[PDB]
Amino acid sequence: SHENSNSATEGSTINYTTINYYKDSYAATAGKQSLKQDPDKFANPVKDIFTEMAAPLK
């Protein structure tokens, strides 16, 4: 239970479920990540968004 929190992902809001037999957290299994996405960070990175039906150049 008491274990060094010394993996590369400790310090994020994403919840993992790993298996370990050691005191170091980086030896653990990779596990299942959270299935969250942010496509607008690359696909819609605009200050003032526009809707679908509207003509954007208004």
């Binding site: 060094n4 929190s5 010394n6 590369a8 310090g11 994020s12 994403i14 298996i19 370990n20 037999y21 050691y22 005191k23 170091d24 980086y26 030896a27 653990a28 299994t29 990779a30 596990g31 990540q33 959270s34 299935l35 969250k36 996405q37 942010d38 496509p39 960070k41 690359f42 696909a43 003509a55 954007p56 150049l57």
Partner: protein, 242 residues
Amino acid sequence: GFPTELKPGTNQFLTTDDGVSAPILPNFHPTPCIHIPGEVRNLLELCQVETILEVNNVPTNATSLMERLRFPVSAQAGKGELCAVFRADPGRDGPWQSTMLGQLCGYYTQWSGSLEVTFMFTGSFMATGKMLIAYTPPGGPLPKDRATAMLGTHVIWDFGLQSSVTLVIPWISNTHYRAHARDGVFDYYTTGLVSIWYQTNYVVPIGAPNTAYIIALAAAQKNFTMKLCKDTSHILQTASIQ
């Protein structure tokens, strides 16, 4: 002496096995992570990004390799003529190889979902025109004329202030998933064709140039997924690296 029996699958190194290994540095806490922008959490964040589709993939010499990113549209006789035609297959060796979708699909074996092709008109403000962009689902051979192509899924695009239309190539498939197609029995996984036809004409006034170009931009939709990760085939390396 807790008795055990070792089962087969013993003393093999399976590369995709996720287990616990022995750590080399005990009581090592790493450097903290600062907030860096641009964090990726899924590659489908990038398949939904518009990248340039090399429709006019005719030239090969270095002098004219930037010509592959835009294809021409000019003045015609008004007979419903053909501009360009290409396959809607991302993994197939063709225009989609230039896209981020067509390169991250090399690392996956089965894909599903709708696509998205965005054409932008890069002509004069005074130039007008109407075009028919037809998606022909499978079975349909290459349409010889525009009448055979309007029977499919299509968009009529009128040039104007909004210089860009989006043809959505929708998921019209027998299988839930679809693998990569090629000449042979894997044409079973062909997606169809996409053709561009002159609807009316490219009308231009005197003083403006008689020719323009259209830049295509291809991506994927929110229902798109890939499956069964693999190694890519449509890029290979001549040996003796460094």
